[PDB]
RNA sequence: CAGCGAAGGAUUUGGUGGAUUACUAGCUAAUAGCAAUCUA
């Protein structure tokens, strides 16, 4: 239950730093703020590393074995991570701002540009155990006079070519015996040298500067001593070079400027292969694939990330995120994608597994305040500060409906019908609730009776009663449908922000400004029970303010709460860097999550070092409708916290004779039901999978009819989280058919137990199985046409 | 100099101010004891903030209530509201928060009108 | 015994052990290299930061260590190791079996004295290299010439000579010619220390009776004598900043300061270190500086500074006494209890037999701080009792930290040796708290716990009674009386709903906590010594008296595992943070790891000291053990955080031993099965034209499969290559004169989807065929070969409606069951 | 065995509190006399409409029950009896007089039938409420009645109404008062004696429904 | 932008062939996403 | 007054030291030198 771990970070495909590819360039590693995201672009998936720098990261490299990563932040706190185990190996503090870090091509050394010293360390093994000091220093060279801007290793890991703000570039041999081969310095640029590369044969050296000159250096005679043979110029007048890279094998120089324009050249002849623009913001990063076919560009101001193949002129992806400006989120009615309403005025529909945005919608001319799904993922409603609620078909991607009032107000929250006839929206300057029909477009009603700004709205999903709650310290329940026009006001102790509604519509949980979460019975309007949450809230100290984090009244309350789908838990977040979840029977804190440890954000540290910034805040929390997770719209992105059953041995009434050995003996002796319930009492995912695949098709329905009723949600949620990605489609559908036929009355009379295990199953039937069935159906009908009709002339 | 706490209990036009502080255990309404609060059939309406949580909460604190306005039943409802939320506020400020919200849970399970009145009315249908 | 889960990382909390440290000087800064058992540690003397720790543990204890500029020379059992930045550069094996026990380094020479009164000289090869490396000669101090060698020094400007300080004599060797130049007269008492003065050719000798001699090593006389009666002299140091002071260090822990110019005694720092641990073991002035670094055997390293004089004209006669400056320290006795302060594995609380509670940092050793015992004020205003001469609290039996409400109120609850109340502490303030919870039955505190709401603390007395106090306000809330003998374990649920107590009468009581009922009581077969509650999985483990570990869950109150194998009393145990393993340690000098899923012993370590405490980190990072000897905390890292270990039992289905199940490729040949690959490949193939608008071997294998009537290699190549390659191979298939390549592709797809594997890909390959050149198939429809190939493709493909009505049933009934 | 200590000093207050008043902190009884536990509703379909599961100290809960439809199904049935007792033009508003005569009638119910008077009045409700009735199917006013069933809230409503107005007319000009006539009515309705106005009226309504069923 | 960035609490940030069209919706490989009534 | 109460108790304040981010050493013209010195 409560054992959530940080899974993913949706939104924000790039923040600051350098993009890296893999060696077999399938994944790309992107520095999001202090995490690192890794997007696998072929196997369409994505993860974010769990570890966390304390400032924004500025350098990334992983060796070409793929086996370990090193990430340096913007004051030199390096972190060495095991890339396969996903666990951090060492924390090493270089003392000043490191501009670049690079592993050697042979993997065994890495070097980095810390200030004006090039320092080469040698890589610790991944097979060795963790030591107190795993890095052993090779050397530290100081020949530059100002800060080094770039490294480049040679093809053999033998020379290293560094570029500085000082107007030179230098070549250093790795070992001392080749010191005479590499002792030259390369002058002649008017500005900062942005890059210095070898050719494929390491005979020519190209040095690209900030003003726009690329110099070709050759070991010629005018003795032989590294002349400059040709200077080529970009002649981009106002713009200047922001990032350079070179693929030496395909002779491809890729250059991004401070105007969004990037050009890519075939270098020793200097012929413009292509020139095109990311946008208007500067191109902060260029990176290239190992085969040189993909170019990943990152612009840091809008947080955007291209990877673009330059042969077939086409963008593998275009993915722009939102730093700090995200007002709301909503899970799709199957937990496959999250819709994000963001303050720059747009809707963005992010896939969860593959961490990318599918569609974006810009028809609001101001900050979109709320999104909400309806009609089972077919329609999606959003309300913004420009005065409009509007509806979005997620099939034809059209804004088909726009609802305004008559009073020119700005809407801050909405709520739709279950049977989506009516949308409803509340403002923070009008004290009314606006009730629109969705079929026609008209303003059906204006509900009046709050004496304070309507902070939150929610329709009960079962009996369709409206619950609004406002800053006049009052939650209010409106019976709209069918001749009632009934109003029931429940007073509460302080002013309310974030009401939420149970999945059965029985109760409503409100968050108040005191710091509490009160839970009320709707039909008999009396309080069922409250949680006192203002003492398990982490409220950090800002830098500008002159009052301690203990005595602050800034963020000791929750501005967004949400029920779990079994109705038993509440996740909650606010303008603080803790999100807390509770179980509402016992009113006790299950777990508290620190949403950021970035010291670049403001409200993170409670105690500031006695030796504006974007504050940290969560603006919306939601539980996943299909699989045991929650998304939180922080300032860093959409933090996705999820459990997984691979770890955490948590049995269910095992005894001493219940053992993996006992389970495989019962499987080998083919008591299949006993093996299945032994694996359920182990609650071990590999054992459940092993027994599940070992049961034959002949006796799926006998086992599925004899499964005990306490192990029913376990086998249903297992079949869901297995069958989304497993290939055994007919096996999983046979099991689903046998379970629904044998015990599908228990499910119907215990709806909210199997409310997230059944939504995960019909995330498998309509999303892989129905697509396959559509393909075979179209093949059958094209066959019947192509052989049944007359093609003659 | 003493840890003290002041709360208010209201029904229609009665209003009761309750001062709770640390002491020996005496509960006094309008100077007279609590066992004199007429109309004597609603003396248990006055008593139920004591009997719902036990007298061992009141064994270390002394309450005094001053009740003006209203009528007989509005004054006993003001008294019981003032006593209840005064005990809650004292255990908030000077005893632990766990006993604070245990008291809030007990009073709210009996009736939350011990703690929150029904105040602004009517409804214009 | 080497392990396969945990590997040794460091032993934290150690600063010194009373080997005389060495000082070294890089440039104008100073470092201080102190021995901690078998490693040394380099400290930055301007701030006492830990720069370096030696990379490997030496095979025995380091016994004499010196430091020139970049290099540190550490002598242990037989040999001298030359270390730079911790990493060992060289190892000089001596040709003896005698233990090397002194050394000096001057010039190209390293001179190492053994304990059989032989001296080994080692020489550089060429005077430009970094350390002395080659053997040169051997010197011997026989019984005629002098006693046991008590020090080995080189006083300056002495061209390749060596002052050897024996117990009675002072010899002077020429170490190039191997000669004994000068042997002094005897000394009437045994000399223990020597230090060269910054005066030219003067050494200072310290005797076992109380006198400092100032021997002039060229005249052969003694210049002066300083008498400190009944004090054995253990250190000598000289001030070199224009103030001629000497600092002697006395093995009753005293540091006495003398003016040599005006022959007075400046000041005495009394009890600067403990006499019982050696007194002041090495004291030295950082040269040119008024700061002196002392170190003692009580695991402590201090600095004292001389402020400038307070008289503005006299100065030299008004010498302000030395004051204290920075210091580092740890426990002076081996720790008795261990806990982790937080889930981040950053701080760990640690209590020792020297009656101190330290908070040690696993990230940066400067952050280690002693929790203060300065009591608060009484709550009413009365007086607090106790002695006026303040001493530390009795040594800590148990503790329990739960930082849910941290900074808010009291946070740690701790139980001391043979006293009837449990103190509280605040980890945020790093100090004691206002409350001491009594047991109320005149019994000593045998266990403590506290809930994870942070509101409640639980005391378990030796007369069998659990008392539940509030941590905020410090008063008794409840009191359960079930046991009659001593309660050794209390814990509570993560939801404050069921508590579990275990006493050494061998009954585990299960109580409801909100209601004050008991849910049950289970009688085991031995007295229980220790409980550990794994709180997420609700499984608690008991160390019974019959040397078993009983793992029992609190939900259904059954013994669910029973782990046998320990040979003596189980000292400690702890759960893995995922709750899969349990690591125990017992008085048979062993540490075992048990996989309680399978119920067997994964790994065992025979460790020479008995491990008295074992704690996992609250993440899966580290194991922390605590042994009988050694003032620190031994730290291990689990290698199973980076690899996966086999849960296969030691003594003295490889996927099921490695907890995996690689899902088999297809379960039955009559079952449809998708590809082992991404699900999106079907959609990419079906719509890659519009996707991009929004953004040969094949022919030879096809022909060879048409010969052999087996297209398995063709279909393997098709399932292998990429969507652009698939479209570009299907789009070029010779659709013109006899139509062979089309019909070979069609009955290849027939042979493919007869096999019920990759069938969504075979379906999209047929869709791509009909899309690319289904117009030529429609054109020469009624052609015999292509019509028969499509006929048998439909013959196999018409058995695909099993999937259709299967997903129709699942969709319709799932919708009906969910909604209605 | 096992015992919990949860008070650690005998609680004494400076204001002296009566011994039965401080005995009332272990169980809530109506008027500190009549226990609410082991008071069951011996007829199902009326449990969840006669409410005896939150015990009270007096029949003067001033809560608001007339602003949602079935909210008066959880007013305690002693207070519903009290509120139905204070109705006619003479005795409107006089809830303290109604509470006082409810206290008197429960005292004399117990002194006549030595059993729990809350159990007696709950049995009287569940025996009085008619289980069938007739509506007048109109046809423009064709005088024909059709038997309908009757919902449990209407059964509790009409039960309290029949009992209270039977006590009024039985006390109309006899020597007995409303408290004594209501006691006789509740006792006879509890045992179901067919000597009460209330269950004679129930038997007439049910018999007419059986007739023109 | 500038008047509502100073009238707020929380922080608000601020030829070749193509500007790559980084922001673009409608794409789960949809081509004819029009309505049948629209056609 | 009672009570608390070990060769005393309370309040206030100045200075210094250690933490307030996760520990790979100083200098320079830096593949090495110096650190007693870079200069003939």
UniProtKB/Swiss-Prot annotation, chain A:
High-level lineage: Eukaryota, Fungi, Dikarya, Ascomycota, Saccharomycotina
Species annotation: Saccharomyces cerevisiae (strain ATCC 204508 / S288c) (Baker's yeast)
Gene responsible for this protein: PWP2
Entry function: Required for bud-site selection and cell separation. Also involved in nucleolar processing of pre-18S ribosomal RNA.
Protein name (Swiss-Prot/TrEMBL): Periodic tryptophan protein 2
Keywords, ordered alphabetically: Nucleus, Phosphoprotein, Repeat, Ribonucleoprotein, Ribosome biogenesis, rRNA processing, WD repeat
Keyword rRNA processing recorded: yes
A Pfam family the protein falls into: Utp12
Gene3D superfamilies: YVTN repeat-like/Quinoprotein amine dehydrogenase (2.130.10.10)
An annotated Gene Ontology molecular function: mRNA binding
Quaternary context: Interacts with snoRNA U3. Interacts with MPP10. Component of the ribosomal small subunit (SSU) processome composed of at least 40 protein subunits and snoRNA U3.
Any single biological process term in GO: endonucleolytic cleavage to generate mature 5'-end of SSU-rRNA from (SSU-rRNA, 5.8S rRNA, LSU-rRNA)
Taxonomic superkingdom: Eukaryota
Further remark: Present with 16700 molecules/cell in log phase SD medium.
From Swiss-Prot, chain B:
InterPro entries cross-referenced by the UniProt entry: Ribosomal_Su5_D2-typ_SF, Ribosomal_uS9, Ribosomal_uS9_CS, Ribsml_uS5_D2-typ_fold_subgr
NCBIfam families: PRK00474.1
Protein name: Small ribosomal subunit protein uS9A
Gene Ontology biological process terms from the UniProt entry: maturation of SSU-rRNA from tricistronic rRNA transcript (SSU-rRNA, 5.8S rRNA, LSU-rRNA); translational initiation
Functional note: Component of the ribosome, a large ribonucleoprotein complex responsible for the synthesis of proteins in the cell. The small ribosomal subunit (SSU) binds messenger RNAs (mRNAs) and translates the encoded message by selecting cognate aminoacyl-transfer RNA (tRNA) molecules. The large subunit (LSU) contains the ribosomal catalytic site termed the peptidyl transferase center (PTC), which catalyzes the formation of peptide bonds, thereby polymerizing the amino acids delivered by tRNAs into a polypeptide chain.
Residues modified to Phosphoserine: 32, 59, 74
Cross-link Glycyl lysine isopeptide (Lys-Gly) (interchain with G-Cter in ubiquitin) residue location(s): 28, 45, 57
Predominant location: cytoplasm
Organism: Saccharomyces cerevisiae (strain ATCC 204508 / S288c) (Baker's yeast)
Molecular function terms from GO: RNA binding; structural constituent of ribosome
Pfam families, A to Z: Ribosomal_S9
Keywords assigned: Acetylation, Cytoplasm, Isopeptide bond, Phosphoprotein, Ribonucleoprotein, Ribosomal protein, Ubl conjugation
Gene Ontology cellular component terms for the protein in this record: 90S preribosome; cytosol; cytosolic small ribosomal subunit
Family stated for the protein in its record: Belongs to the universal ribosomal protein uS9 family.
General remark: Present with 33800 molecules/cell in log phase SD medium. There are 2 genes for uS9 in yeast.
Gene (UniProt): RPS16A
Modified residues (Phosphothreonine): 68
Location(s), subcellular: Cytoplasm
Swiss-Prot record, chain C:
WD repeat feature ranges: 22-53, 63-93, 101-140, 150-183, 190-227, 234-269, 277-329, 336-370, 397-436, 445-479, 487-523, 528-563, 565-606, 608-646
Main location (coarse class): nucleus
Localization terms from the record: Nucleus, Nucleolus
Pfam name, any one: Beta-prop_WDR36-Utp21_2nd
Gene Ontology terms: cellular component: 90S preribosome; nucleolus; nucleoplasm; nucleus; Pwp2p-containing subcomplex of 90S preribosome; small-subunit processome
Parts forming coiled coils: none
Record flagged with keyword Signal: no
Keywords: Acetylation, Nucleus, Phosphoprotein, Repeat, Ribonucleoprotein, Ribosome biogenesis, rRNA processing, WD repeat
InterPro entries: Quinoprotein_ADH-like_sf, SSU_processome_Utp21, WD40/YVTN_repeat-like_dom_sf, WD40_repeat_CS, WD40_repeat_dom_sf, WD40_rpt
Protein's GO biological process: maturation of SSU-rRNA; rRNA processing
Top-level taxonomic group: Eukaryota
Alphabetical list of PANTHER family matching this protein: WD REPEAT-CONTAINING PROTEIN 36 (PTHR22840:SF12)
Domain notes: The WD repeats are grouped into two tandem seven-bladed beta-propeller regions.
Function, as annotated: Involved in nucleolar processing of pre-18S ribosomal RNA and ribosome assembly.
Assembly mode: Interacts with snoRNA U3. Interacts with MPP10. Interacts (via WD repeats) with UTP18. Component of the ribosomal small subunit (SSU) processome composed of at least 40 protein subunits and snoRNA U3.
Misc note: Present with 2020 molecules/cell in log phase SD medium.
Protein name (database record): U3 small nucleolar RNA-associated protein 21
Native organism taxonomy: Eukaryota, Fungi, Dikarya, Ascomycota, Saccharomycotina
Gene name of this polypeptide: UTP21
From Swiss-Prot, chain E:
Domain of life: Eukaryota
Entry's localization field: Nucleus, Nucleolus
Homology family: Belongs to the MPP10 family.
Subunit structure: Component of a heterotrimeric complex containing IMP3, IMP4 and MPP10. Interacts with snoRNA U3. Component of the ribosomal small subunit (SSU) processome composed of at least 40 protein subunits and snoRNA U3. Interacts with the SSU processome subunits EMG1, IMP3, IMP4, KRR1, NOC4/UTP19, NOP1, RPS4A, RPS4B, RPS6A, RPS6B, RPS7A, RPS7B, RPS9A, RPS9B, RPS14A, RPS14B, UTP1-UTP18, UTP20-UTP22 and UTP25.
Role description: Involved in nucleolar processing of pre-18S ribosomal RNA. Required for the early cleavages at sites A0, A1 and A2 during 18S ribosomal pre-RNA processing.
Protein name listed in UniProt: U3 small nucleolar RNA-associated protein MPP10
Organism: Saccharomyces cerevisiae (strain ATCC 204508 / S288c)
Name of the gene encoding the protein in the UniProt record: MPP10
Residues of the full protein shown: 446 to 495 of 593
